[PDB]
Amino acid sequence: MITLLVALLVLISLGLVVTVPVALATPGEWEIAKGKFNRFFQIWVFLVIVIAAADGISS
Template sequence: MTTAVQLLVFILVILSTLLVVGIPVTLASPGQWEKSKKLVYTSAGIWAGLVIITGVVNSFIA
C-alpha cells in the first residue's frame, strides 16, 4: 500500500510541475488560451482528483 501512495505522489509531483510550467506559457501565448482551454481545465480536474485519491489511499495506511 505504501508503494501505491508513493506512486500517486510521484505522479502528482510530475503533473504539478507540468501545470506550473504549462499554464503560464499557455496564458502568455497569444491565441493559445482558446485552443488549450479544454486541456487546461481537464488537467486541473485530473490534478484535483489525484489529490483526493492520494489522500484517501493515504488514510488507509495510518
C-alpha cells in the same frame, strides 16, 4: 501505492508549472486550449483526493 501517486502528482505539477503560464501569456492559446488544461486540472485535483483517500485509509 501512495508513493506512486505522489510521484505522478509531482510530474503533473511540473508539467503544469511550465505550460500553464505559457498558455496564458501567449495571447490566443488559452481559449483554444483550456479543455486540455482543465482536463489536466481535474487529473491534478483527482490525484489529491485519491492520495488523501489512500493516506487516511492506511492510517
